């Protein structure tokens, strides 16, 4: 197998990988990108005169990393635990009729729920945060201005 036969295989592999890439069939496109790069790697070992070969190897392997697709979920798990904690504390002051602290704690929960919902695109998370903020604001206002 010489460079000329390896370069031609590399062209048929990449042509098939890009059309599967186009079709969103990303998992078989990884396979043919990996076959393409490997054909080129052997081709450079065989003395390939192709002038952009190293670039094209690197192109295809990067496309495999791009298609392969965290610490933000960690942050949001803790933010929710805090909102839950704040509301729980407020629940404590609420039942003990420590009205002023209950109001402060309910409204700090509000700020945390609205602020966290600007840090996400998950609309289901956004609404759950806004429903807890709405509920806590309602109760704070109930403690603050009894009708």
């Amino acid at each position: 197998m010489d460079a000329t036969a390896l370069e031609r295989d590399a062209v048929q592999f990449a042509r098939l990988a890009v059309q599967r890439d186009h079709e969103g069939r990303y998992s078989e496109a990884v396979f043919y990108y990996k076959e393409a790069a490997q054909a080129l790697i052997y081709a450079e070992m065989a003395g390939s005169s192709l002038e952009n070969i190293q670039e094209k190897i690197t192109e295809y392997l990067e496309r495999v990393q791009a298609l392969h697709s965290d610490p933000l979920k960690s942050k949001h798990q803790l933010d929710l635990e805090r909102a839950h904690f704040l509301v729980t504390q407020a629940f404590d002051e609420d039942e003990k009729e420590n009205v002023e602290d209950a109001i402060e704690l309910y409204t700090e929960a509000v700020d945390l729920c609205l602020k966290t919902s600007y840090e996400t695109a998950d609309k289901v998370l956004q609404n759950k945060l806004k429903q807890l903020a709405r509920q806590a604001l309602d109760r704070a206002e109930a403690l603050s201005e009894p009708l």
């Binding site: 062209v11 890009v18 192109e59 990067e62 791009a66 839950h84 807890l132």
Partner: peptide
């Protein structure tokens, strides 16, 4: 000729809500 790549690339609110529900009473 070698083609190029495409341009193309919790807690439980419910127990809170339940407790809020009882508080409106």
């Amino acid at each position: 000729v070698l083609p190029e790549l495409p341009s193309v690339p919790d807690i439980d609110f419910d127990d809170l809500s339940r407790r809020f529900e009882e508080l409106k009473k």
